[PDB]
Design a protein around this ligand. Sequence first.
Ligand SMILES: C[C@H]1CN(S(=O)(=O)c2ccccc2)[C@@H](CCc2c(F)cccc2NC(=O)CC(c2ccc(F)cc2)c2ccc(F)cc2)CN1
Ligand SMILES: [Cl-]
Ligand SMILES: [Cl-]
Ligand SMILES: [Cl-]
Lengths: 99, 99
Amino acid sequence: PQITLWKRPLVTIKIGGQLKEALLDTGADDTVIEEMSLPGRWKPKMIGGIGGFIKVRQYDQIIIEICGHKAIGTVLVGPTPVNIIGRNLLTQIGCTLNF
Amino acid sequence: PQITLWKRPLVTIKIGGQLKEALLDTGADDTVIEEMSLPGRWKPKMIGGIGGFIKVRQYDQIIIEICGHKAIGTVLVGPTPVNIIGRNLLTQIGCTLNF
Ligand SMILES: C[C@H]1CN(S(=O)(=O)c2ccccc2)[C@@H](CCc2c(F)cccc2NC(=O)CC(c2ccc(F)cc2)c2ccc(F)cc2)CN1
Ligand SMILES: [Cl-]
Ligand SMILES: [Cl-]
Ligand SMILES: [Cl-]
């Protein structure tokens, strides 16, 4: 698909058996999801920018379905104000910026 | 151009006759640049990031060139960690997300 940017590019995703809304963010290196349970090992990480930093749990090798496209990668879980799909997963679905 | 997301989507911008590097960010509603002098009056604005809200200065109808494409619009100035081109200007240059 082609997504315009008149409004926030929010899409439905499937992660850990749950349907969630997430923002496609070209300006995020990593994917960050609001508090939820995920399987496997995790390690702590700090991520931040505007308004400072937050502590998150880093889970590796997590499968996500974004607009019918399956992708696998690291997912950070923590107190983010919005679910964010970062470049680590946007590359896997072949997402590009065009102008 | 078509920009892939294996690296951060950093481009050259020109604002106030100066070249700067900025990130194309589909996850940002607005454009925010690091401290610099802009003409005219400014208005107060709060923007929310991953860690909370920050105060910035809102300047309107500012001329800015993004990757060679001319735009004229709102530019926020504040303590952002990187210069960010948000949807207000990405729409002006005809930027879309495609997969
Ligand atoms: C370059 C980084 C800079 N920041 S970040 O927080 O520092 C960060 C740094 C490292 C990792 C993750 C995030 C982000 C954009 C922030 C931003 C601007 F920069 C300029 C102008 C506006 C805004 N904010 C929004 O538009 C609100 C919006 C939002 C998106 C991401 C977010 F995290 C927090 C909030 C939103 C809120 C609620 C909701 F329901 C839906 C969407 C992402 N790109
Ligand atoms: Cl990854
Ligand atoms: Cl590619
Ligand atoms: Cl604008």
